[PDB]
């Protein structure tokens, strides 16, 4: 059996430099990482090199428009390999940017 859409969705929070400030525990059963080992690390460290430029542009669009839908991209999984994701990022501003909220969906087939 394979996981559905909801079970393949995890939330993450980032500072404006892309560093993780929060990550939902659901990332562990999907990508192998424990949230605590992601804190303080730039999201960019996990992008597959072939998606890095597209992710730079998606971050630039997010910073100017306040919200963005990324294209399909690869994130390095803990024990090797890359998983395909799509993220909806949203900037939380002080009505000045405070942080970025990501809703991350794993596109790849994940068992269970």
């Amino acid at each position: 059996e394979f996981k559905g859409l909801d079970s393949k969705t995890f939330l993450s929070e980032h500072s404006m430099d892309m560093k993780f400030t929060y990550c939902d525990d659901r990332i562990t059963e999907l990508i192998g990482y424990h949230p605590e080992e992601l804190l303080g690390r730039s999201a960019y460290e996990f992008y597959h090199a072939l998606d890095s430029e597209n992710m730079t542009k998606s971050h630039q669009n997010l910073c100017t428009k306040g919200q963005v839908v990324s294209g399909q991209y690869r994130m390095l999984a803990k024990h090797g390999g890359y998983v395909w994701l799509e993220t909806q990022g949203t900037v939380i501003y002080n009505p000045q940017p405070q942080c970025i909220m990501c809703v991350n969906y794993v596109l790849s087939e994940i068992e269970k």
Binding site: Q67, T90, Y93, P95, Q98, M101, Y105
Partner: protein, 107 residues
């Protein structure tokens, strides 16, 4: 200073990040299954219900709301909740609301 929560369109907490303890004093298990309006000051309840109704119509745009939240330490804390709906585009499941809740100054 802040915590994330996920709600159904009625306002029920369906996900609460552990930073809620430092922000409002409650454990996530004390918030889950309860409605956000149950922790809201009676003067702000209708504004909070109207804001949850409207965030659904705004297409993923952020809707902010300031209201008084009753902490576990029996104080009315000013909270600024920035909310937006999320609906997985590969599905037609009912949208849910994502919130970032911060204790802010009314000054």
């Amino acid at each position: 200073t802040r915590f994330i929560s996920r709600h159904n369109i009625e306002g029920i907490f369906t996900f609460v990040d552990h930073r809620c303890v430092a922000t409002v004093g409650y454990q996530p298990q004390e918030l889950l299954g309860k409605n956000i309006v149950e922790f809201c000051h009676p003067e702000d309840q209708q504004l909070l219900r109207d804001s949850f109704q409207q965030v659904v119509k705004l297409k993923g745009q952020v809707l902010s709301v300031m209201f008084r939240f009753r902490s576990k330490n029996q104080e009315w804390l000013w909270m600024r909740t920035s909310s937006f709906t999320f609906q997985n585009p590969y599905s037609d499941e009912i949208e849910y609301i994502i919130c970032t809740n911060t204790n802010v100054k009314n000054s």
